[PDB]
Amino acid sequence: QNITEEFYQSTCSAVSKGYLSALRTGWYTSVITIELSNIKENKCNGTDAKVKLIKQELDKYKNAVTELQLLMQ
Amino acid sequence: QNITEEFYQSTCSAVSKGYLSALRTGWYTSVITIELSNIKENKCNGTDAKVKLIKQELDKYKNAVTELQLLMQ
Amino acid sequence: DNAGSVSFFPQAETCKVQSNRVFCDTMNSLTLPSEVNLCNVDIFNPKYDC
Amino acid sequence: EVLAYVVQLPLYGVIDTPCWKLHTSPLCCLTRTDRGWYC
Amino acid sequence: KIMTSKTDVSSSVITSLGAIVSCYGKTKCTASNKNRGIIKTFSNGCDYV
């Protein structure tokens, strides 16, 4: 144990001594990019023709990406 | 460029002039509702009868909704 | 302790503590003389107005 | 079977006012302490 | 409203478009550039970079 406490009755206060510091004086930036492992619709029919998981799952994404493209200006 | 800096040695301070503003003086509320596209359990048997995806997937939800219904008071 | 002087971070948000090691944000810190340390011992220390 | 939440947008009282921001540093020892944004 | 002090103090404060160097006392302040390295030492006063 490094850290200790002193109590001063003169001022009725207590100090907590024994800390080492790091004072932030600037920023370091980095540009991370990432790519989409894209799915190509597979053409053929499933058990239920009225169900296109792959298309909807992309429109779920596409439309999400679109909603973010609207926040930058 | 609009934004500039003036430096005063008299006071050892720096101004950043050239900003246009918006001061929030109230709130605008809106009541958004949304409905659940509900699934009806499909009665018949799958490869493993001990597995009821459709049921467990509703109870996963149901129970979330319930846990929220306990936060309003 | 900054170089020579003393930095004072008054909001509890801007300082993170781990173990025995503090990380503070200097964005809004105050810079005081090392003589503020004499305020803890005497409130009317004549070398600094506590 | 249906969820309803209240969104809360801000409304601005005044706009296109000129604003500014003050940083201050020791002067020797003075230190201005009215630091921040003025509008 | 000002904050006063009967002793020499030294620090810096980085502004929106630069920085402020309070160089006072026996302290040793300077301003480096990434390409050119140190391009200015500071005498006792409030300078803006």
Swiss-Prot record, chain D:
The chain holds residues 295 to 343 of 574 of the full protein. It is a single-pass type I membrane protein; Single-pass membrane protein. Changing C39S: Impairs translation or folding of the F protein. Class I viral fusion protein. Under the current model, the protein has at least 3 conformational states: pre-fusion native state, pre-hairpin intermediate state, and post-fusion hairpin state. During viral and plasma cell membrane fusion, the coiled coil regions assume a trimer-of-hairpins structure, positioning the fusion peptide in close proximity to the C-terminal region of the ectodomain. The formation of this structure appears to drive apposition and subsequent fusion of viral and cellular membranes leading to delivery of the nucleocapsid into the cytoplasm. It is found in: Virion membrane; Host cell membrane. The N-terminus is a hydrophobic fusion peptide that inserts into the target host membrane. It is buried in the center of the trimer cavity before cleavage by host furin. The coiled coil (heptad repeat) regions are probably involved in homotrimerization, heterodimerization and in the formation of a fusion-active hairpin structure. It comes from Human respiratory syncytial virus A (strain A2). It comes from the Viruses. This is Fusion glycoprotein F1. Disulfide bonds join C19-C39, C28-C29. Changing C29S: Impairs translation or folding of the F protein. Homotrimer. Heterodimer with fusion protein F2; disulfide-linked. Interacts with host NCL; this interaction plays a role in viral entry into the host cell. As a heterodimer with F2, interacts with host heparan sulfate. As a heterodimer with F2, interacts with host IGF1R; this interaction activates PRKCZ/PKCzeta that recruits NCL/nucleolin from the host nucleus to the plasma membrane. Part of a complex composed of F1, F2 and G glycoproteins. As a heterodimer with F2, interacts with host RHOA; this interaction facilitates virus-induced syncytium formation.
